[PDB]
Design a protein around this ligand. Sequence first.
Ligand SMILES: NC(=[NH2+])NCCC[C@H](N)C(=O)O
Ligand SMILES: NC(=[NH2+])NCCC[C@H](N)C(=O)O
Ligand code: NA
Lengths: 225, 225
Amino acid sequence: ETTVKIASDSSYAPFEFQNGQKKWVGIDVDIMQEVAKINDWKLEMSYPGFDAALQNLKAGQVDGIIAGMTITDERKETFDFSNPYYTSALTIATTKDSKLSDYSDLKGKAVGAKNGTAAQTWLQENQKKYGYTIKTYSDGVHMFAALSSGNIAGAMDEVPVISYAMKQGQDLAMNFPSISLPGGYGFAVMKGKNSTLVDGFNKALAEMKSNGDYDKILKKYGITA
Amino acid sequence: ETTVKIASDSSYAPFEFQNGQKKWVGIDVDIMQEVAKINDWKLEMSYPGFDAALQNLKAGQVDGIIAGMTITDERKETFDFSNPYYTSALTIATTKDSKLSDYSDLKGKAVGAKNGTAAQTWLQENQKKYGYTIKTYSDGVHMFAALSSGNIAGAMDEVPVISYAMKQGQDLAMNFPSISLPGGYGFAVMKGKNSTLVDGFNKALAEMKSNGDYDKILKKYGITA
Ligand SMILES: NC(=[NH2+])NCCC[C@H](N)C(=O)O
Ligand SMILES: NC(=[NH2+])NCCC[C@H](N)C(=O)O
Ligand code: NA
């Protein structure tokens, strides 16, 4: 009944990614599809990439974005957000048999993050305090390979990313604290616009938490912390 | 197996509280029981109240504390902590049919909080910014009854506490932004003592986060990790 165009990232597991059949799957895909059905929306998903999705949203070529997008006060100056649909935390992953548990245990060790991330910033801000060296990576495939090889002692990323990788059978544990960003992940529209879409998102999310569909989706993608 | 004596609060749902059959339950209870099992400890829980628990810990009558205890610099002068096992936050609960969605909407409205809480402090610190009046309550039963009756327009409390109240079927919604409580909640021992207990807690938490048991426990009380 109402056509709703949503843009998303092209590859950001477990939020949105293609499986082996090239079907779009992930937490964001499954949530958005169920929200649309609850609200009687005809959903038209596109996957141009995070940056392109933002460009398209601002130009009015799409109506909203869901793309592992952390809610921040700066972003709220441009966008209106839903209630968060998942908590947004960071953590340092280790290999499965690692006994590292505390930040002081990284002294003298190398710790990875992806270039241009909150994780990179945290590591930079805490390097002198705990005495590790930092290694920067292009993507998760390279960072986690380095962790499994022992070339780094830890890899800092978003908790859902590490959880998914773990569920897939990667050699990983979550031995360190979760560092919370308060915003959570949100559905976004342009500021002042499409408040009915945000409200339908909010109402559907509440129903899904209530009826257990929300928890089914998280467990499908191995999201446990 | 060695006996481990742990003290907690007497009523802090959903962390520790007595249910309808008068059984001690909650996130802290379930986590501590699973940590003990993982570590082959015989756990002896007591529930004298937070302040009594600190007294008992300082006197050597118990070995540790779990009681939604914020990790703070002040506290770290007396106590050693585990990695935080949960990071709480503050937000405004409204009735389910309330249309309020942001702090600016509270101008000219009465907003409640419990006496002697972070929520109260936050409200007092932000009153001039948003322009509400503050009403103080002894406990949750009283604050939430005032909200349901329309005598207050919102109630400031912790996300986990509101989440559980909603699970129990109270007429509540969480449509406002959250305010992070720096530190997270940790397991505590006397400074320099009982390193075995802190290490056992850290390693067991990592296993429970890694194997899904941590998530299952939160979900039982309506909380998303
Ligand atoms: N699909 C994505 N890469 N989304 C952005 C992920 C990084 C971070 N959560 C952010 O909001 O900036
Ligand atoms: N009944 C309660 N709400 N107890 C709260 C006391 C613990 C509080 N989070 C603190 O760290 O000081
Ligand atoms: Na906290």
